[PDB]
Every structure is written in structure tokens, then in C-alpha cells.
Design a protein around this ligand. Sequence first.
Ligand code: R4S
Length: 280
Amino acid sequence: PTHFEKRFLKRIRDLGEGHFGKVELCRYDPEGDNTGEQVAVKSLKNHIADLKKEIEILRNLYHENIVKYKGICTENGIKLIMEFLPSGSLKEYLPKNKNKINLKQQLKYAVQICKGMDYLGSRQYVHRDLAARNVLVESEHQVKIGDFGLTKAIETDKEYYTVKDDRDSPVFWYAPECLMQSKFYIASDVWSFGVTLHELLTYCDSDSSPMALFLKMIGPTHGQMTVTRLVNTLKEGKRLPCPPNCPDEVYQLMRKCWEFQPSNRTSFQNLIEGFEALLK
Ligand SMILES: O=C(N[C@@]12C[C@@H]1CN(c1nc(Nc3cnn(CCO)c3)ncc1F)C2)C1CC1
């Protein structure tokens, strides 16, 4: 049930790619009649230790708005087997469905992301990579958090996890404590959600992305100096602007995600209630 043989994993196309990881669409067809189910397969281009930790996290997560763990494919090597969501990420889905997805549907997606994130927090995890590119579309009515590559477990009686590695990170979705001290709280994921909500409301328009907006604020910056300028911009109280046609009530909840201090930010449960109060 949870074990998948490499020989039966029939590669169809690439779904996503990171620095050391890749996700491919496969058809697990043990009968050899092309009737088996389509699955998402996470493999490596040590990073094995990380992938094993990611497998363990996803195996332990079971929620309507969290990509379903299916099993593993062992080669020393290992592959993570997940369900395949045919519509892909919000980053790809939203620019192609601008006339289909109205504000009501975007708020239903925000509720769904927050429910998935609240459950993640209840398990004492910090995602650290909440962006539209990691929110997958099951159908026009449902989304799921679909990647856990940077997810860490907060130790019991601790409020945050401290990152100790040399890995790359989505700095444009990061809260000040992440940027300044490499500290990741549940309140750090709330900040990233705020940024993800901004993307969702702009229909993931490339010219309106956090990197594009912040880079037009900051200017020519260089990989070394990006973080210090970003921190300086945030310290000055600058934030991503209200997307076009975003009502004030929605932008107010977004601003509650961007309080400089983690202890002053809204919770995911307060966000759920807040968005549901707006859905009629
Ligand atoms: O690619 C990565 N992670 C994931 C989140 C990305 C896409 N992923 C998954 N994608 C899908 N379906 C689908 C359909 N179309 N497309 C293309 C992009 O719109 C993706 N289902 C399950 C998934 F698990 C996994 C890490 C860097 C390697």
C-alpha cells in the first residue's frame, strides 16, 4: 500500500524543480496496462537526510488542505510519493483563470490555506516556505499546501526553530525575525501567508510579485546585500501595497500578518474567522 517499485513509476513530465530536488508526474502502473493512478514523485537531482525528514513530516500530516502522502520508493536512495493535483500551483493556475476566480473564491482559498496552516501549527511545525508556488489546486473549489521541503519541528516548550544551515531561502516571503536572527515561529508562517494572500489577490501577476515589487523599492541590490536592504525597508514600516480591487477589510487582515513583532501578529484561527465573516 505505501511501497512503490521504481520500475512501475512511469515518468510522464516534470512538475517542479528546486536546487537539489525535483517533482515528476508518474503513472504507477504495476499491471502494465496503462490503467494505474497518476502520482507526484519527489526525488533528488546530505540531501537524502533532508528528504527522509520531509517524508516523516508529510506521513504525520493528514488534512483536507494538505497534499496527501501516498508512500515511498526506495532505490540508499529514496523518493516521496504523493497524490497528483492536475491543475498545479496557484502561481500557474491564477493568471489563466482571472475571469473564473472572483474575490469570493480567492477568500475561500485563503480560508483553506489558513485551515491547512493552523493544522500544521497544531502539530508544532513551521513550514518556512509558504508561497503561492506551494499552494496546489485540486479543483476550482479546493486548494492544498503542497510542499514541505523547508518544514521544521519546533521543540516542545520552545516558541521557534533556529535554522543552522547554508541553504537558500525565500527571503521575500520572510518575517523580520527570520531575516535578522534566522528564527522561525508560527507567527513567521502568518507573515508568509500575508505575502501569499497578496499574490493570490494579484492573480500571481509576475510584475506584482514580492521579488519584483521589493526590487523596484530597493533597486540594484546583489545577492549579498538583498537581506540587509529588505530588513531596512521593513524596519522603516514599508509593506506590499493594497492589490488593485482588494477591499479595505481584506487588506486590514493582510496588515495584521505584517506586524514587525511576531507577538503582535494575528493567529491563523483569527484569520479563518475574519475571512469567514466576509463570505456571504
Ligand atoms: O516541485 C516541488 N514541489 C511541488 C510543489 C510543486 C508542484 N508539486 C506538485 N504538483 C502537483 N501537480 C501539478 C500540476 N501541474 N503542475 C505544474 C506547476 O503548476 C504541478 N501535484 C502534486 C505535487 F506534489 C510539488 C519542489 C521543487 C521540487
